Amino acid sequence: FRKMAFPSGKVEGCMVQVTCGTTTLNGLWLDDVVYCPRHVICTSEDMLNPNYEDLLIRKSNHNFLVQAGNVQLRVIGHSMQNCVLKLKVDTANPKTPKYKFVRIQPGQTFSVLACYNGSPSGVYQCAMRPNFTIKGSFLNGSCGSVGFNIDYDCVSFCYMHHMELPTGVHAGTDLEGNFYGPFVDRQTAQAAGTDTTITVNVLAWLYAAVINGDRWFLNRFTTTLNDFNLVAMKYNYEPLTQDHVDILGPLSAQTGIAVLDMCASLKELLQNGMNGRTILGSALLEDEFTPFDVVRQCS
Amino acid sequence: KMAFPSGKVEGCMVQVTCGTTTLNGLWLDDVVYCPRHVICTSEDMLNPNYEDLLIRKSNHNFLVQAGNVQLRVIGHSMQNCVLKLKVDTANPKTPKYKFVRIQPGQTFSVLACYNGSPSGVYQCAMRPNFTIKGSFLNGSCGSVGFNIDYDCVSFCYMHHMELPTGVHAGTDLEGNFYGPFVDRQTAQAAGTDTTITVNVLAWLYAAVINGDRWFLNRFTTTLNDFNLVAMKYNYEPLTQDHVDILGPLSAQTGIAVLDMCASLKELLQNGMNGRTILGSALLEDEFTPFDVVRQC
Numbered sequence: 153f154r155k156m157a158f159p160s161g162k163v164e165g166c167m168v169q170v171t172c173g174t175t176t177l178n179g180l181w182l183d184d185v186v187y188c189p190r191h192v193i194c195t196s197e198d199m200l201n202p203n204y205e206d207l208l209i210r211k212s213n214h215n216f217l218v219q220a221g222n223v224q225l226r227v228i229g230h231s232m233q234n235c236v237l238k239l240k241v242d243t244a245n246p247k248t249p250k251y252k253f254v255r256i257q258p259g260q261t262f263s264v265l266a267c268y269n270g271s272p273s274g275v276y277q278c279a280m281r282p283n284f285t286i287k288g289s290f291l292n293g294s295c296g297s298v299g300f301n302i303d304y305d306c307v308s309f310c311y312m313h314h315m316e317l318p319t320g321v322h323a324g325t326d327l328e329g330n331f332y333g334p335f336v337d338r339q340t341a342q343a344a345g346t347d348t349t350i351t352v353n354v355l356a357w358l359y360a361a362v363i364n365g366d367r368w369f370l371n372r373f374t375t376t377l378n379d380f381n382l383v384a385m386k387y388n389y390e391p392l393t394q395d396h397v398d399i400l401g402p403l404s405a406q407t408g409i410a411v412l413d414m415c416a417s418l419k420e421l422l423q424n425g426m427n428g429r430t431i432l433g434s435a436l437l438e439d440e441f442t443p444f445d446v447v448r449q450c451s
Numbered sequence: 452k453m454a455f456p457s458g459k460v461e462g463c464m465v466q467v468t469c470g471t472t473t474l475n476g477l478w479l480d481d482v483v484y485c486p487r488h489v490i491c492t493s494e495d496m497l498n499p500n501y502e503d504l505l506i507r508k509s510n511h512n513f514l515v516q517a518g519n520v521q522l523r524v525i526g527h528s529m530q531n532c533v534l535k536l537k538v539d540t541a542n543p544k545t546p547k548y549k550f551v552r553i554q555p556g557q558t559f560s561v562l563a564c565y566n567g568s569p570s571g572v573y574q575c576a577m578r579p580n581f582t583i584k585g586s587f588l589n590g591s592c593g594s595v596g597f598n599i600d601y602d603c604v605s606f607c608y609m610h611h612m613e614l615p616t617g618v619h620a621g622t623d624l625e626g627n628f629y630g631p632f633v634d635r636q637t638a639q640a641a642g643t644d645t646t647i648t649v650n651v652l653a654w655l656y657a658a659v660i661n662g663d664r665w666f667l668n669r670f671t672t673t674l675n676d677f678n679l680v681a682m683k684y685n686y687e688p689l690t691q692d693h694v695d696i697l698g699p700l701s702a703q704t705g706i707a708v709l710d711m712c713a714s715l716k717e718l719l720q721n722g723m724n725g726r727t728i729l730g731s732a733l734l735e736d737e738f739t740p741f742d743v744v745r746q747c
């Protein structure tokens with residue numbers, strides 16, 4: 153199994169750069185609106201603790217330089233929605249895909265198109281950790297890079313990048329400007345909750361192992377969801393939600409292994425360890441492949 | 452693990468059908484490139500005589516679809532294991548491009564496609580035994596691998612087959628296989644694979660830059676003494692050019708190349724002792740020094 157990103161072209165066609173003064177970051181051009189992190193209006197010294205409302209009152213449309221490549225896009229209106237700036241422009245992006253804005257749950261994966269100066273650099277697959285950080289590759293200038301999934305022809309934008317935490321992990325918002333997790337866009341020391349293992353994805357990985365004929369860990373037992381959740385927390389695993397049980401439906405149907413039976417198998421692995429064995433050629437249980445990701449790759 | 456943005460290549464993918472065989476093609480200017488085994492039936496694939504099969508085909512036996520639009524084939528030729536279909540329409544999305552043949556150990560991005568439609572993108576290395584550890588399913592043939600420098604796409608790989616071990620094999624865009632493989636439906640084994648040493652070192656430097664350095668030691672080693680141990684463990688030899696290529700990473704961390712070689716030697720001989728490096732229980736060898744530097 154590989155970490156596999158979505159093809160990035162539909163998103164590449166929407167990336168622009170947004171500059172205020174000497175502060176440049178990336179923005180997302182869809183129809184006649186450009187979306188970007190609001191801290192573009194900050195001087196490096198204002199980031200220490202900004203008054204975003206006051207900073208924005210001092211700004212007019214003519215203070216924003218929006219460029220697709222080196223071609224300027226005229227700004228004709230501006231507003232702030234939570235931690236994102238919305239810049240109305242006078243041209244509708246002809247490369248606008250079908251799209252929607254979605255807010256993802258921890259454990260879900262998405263592709264990130266890492267951009268600098270409005271130019272795409274690379275694409276890679278990320279998982280939202282239970283503590284609402286992602287383990288990305290972001291350098292200075294990457295803010296406004298977005299995360300997305302593609303279904304049929306429709307791009308679901310789920311993440312916009314805003315900051316790095318002292319531990320090296322990354323934090324950001326949805327495209328309505330609401331942060332994932334307890335973070336704020338200020339240049340202050342912030343810490344994430346202790347992280348935990350994404351149980352639903354581990355289960356997905358065990359199903360993937362079964363599909364490929366690696367099934368020594370299946371046992372004759374089952375468990376209740378509540379008993380499993382209480383044990384899992386003792387091992388720093390996330391509890392399962394009803395939605396987790398449901399998104400494992402397809403893999404459970406494909407293998408004929410009930411979700412709660414697989415939970416009983418995982419519980420035994422947690423309590424007894426691997427006893428020197430491997431699963432899918434690995435002594436470690438993988439937690440960054442979702443049930444959808446497994447299905448994508450097995451077919 | 453980071454792939455190049457795939458948009459410039461997505462604009463070139465089309466579907467190619469002959470008989471009941473469908474796969475992907477690469478549409479550049481007015482030529483579509485695709486694996487020649489699209490002309491085969493099931494019976495043909497066992498032991499195909501491609502020159503003989505091809506002479507019995509006419510332009511009109513090839514159906515090329517760019518989305519909903521059929522392109523008319525007005526000519527066809529075969530270059531090694533690649534078929535070239537001339538069409539009456541030029542692709543306006545053709546990027547600036549080159550065809551290159553990559554060396555083992557080098558990396559590239561793969562745009563996996565099915566029925567002419569892009570499905571996913573990921574980074575691959577050309578293995579020393581000239582296989583690639585890909586993610587390719589039925590219908591993925593004609594998917595391509597590439598690198599992007601400035602605005603120029605360098606195509607280096609077209610996908611043709613899977614081996615019994617689950618790894619993959621294919622050609623450059625001149626239709627010559629990487630490795631001792633043939634485009635026939637028969638079980639083929641690869642030579643013994645080895646680990647790409649210069650890439651393991653680059654990845655160890657990456658682990659340090661990101662604050663992970665439990666595996667370091669104060670020891671050192673000569674280049675030849677390291678290479679003796681490397682070969683024993685089926686690692687590729689490290690050349691002086693490899694050492695030179697690692698310089699920037701050495702300077703950046705202040706760890707001399709041969710000091711990192713001494714760390715790797717200790718890892719090969721003692722294992723990781725249950726510990727991990729950048730999250731992995733195994734030494735990763737599909738990041739080049741360039742891949743690591745760019746991303747830092």
Ligand SMILES: *[C@@H](O)[C@H](C[C@@H]1CCNC1=O)NC(=O)[C@H](CC(C)C)NC(=O)OC[C@H]1C[C@H]2C=C[C@@H]1C2
Nearest residue numbers: 191199290291292295314315316317318337338339
């Ligand atoms: C995008 O503008 C940038 C992205 C950062 C740069 C390094 N890697 C990233 O992910 N964000 C940025 O500089 C933000 C800006 C504020 C207004 C939110 N601040 C930031 O990333 O601060 C990083 C922290 C972590 C410790 C080191 C520096 C400070 C403290």
Ligand SMILES: *[C@@H](O)[C@H](C[C@@H]1CCNC1=O)NC(=O)[C@H](CC(C)C)NC(=O)OC[C@H]1C[C@H]2C=C[C@@H]1C2
Nearest residue numbers: 488496587588589592611612613614615634635636
């Ligand atoms: C593309 O047409 C297809 C891609 C394969 C299909 C499964 N995964 C892949 O990478 N190639 C293909 O079917 C070739 C065709 C011949 C003429 C080269 N054959 C092939 O890949 O054989 C299937 C594998 C699976 C095991 C049985 C036969 C070999 C090993």
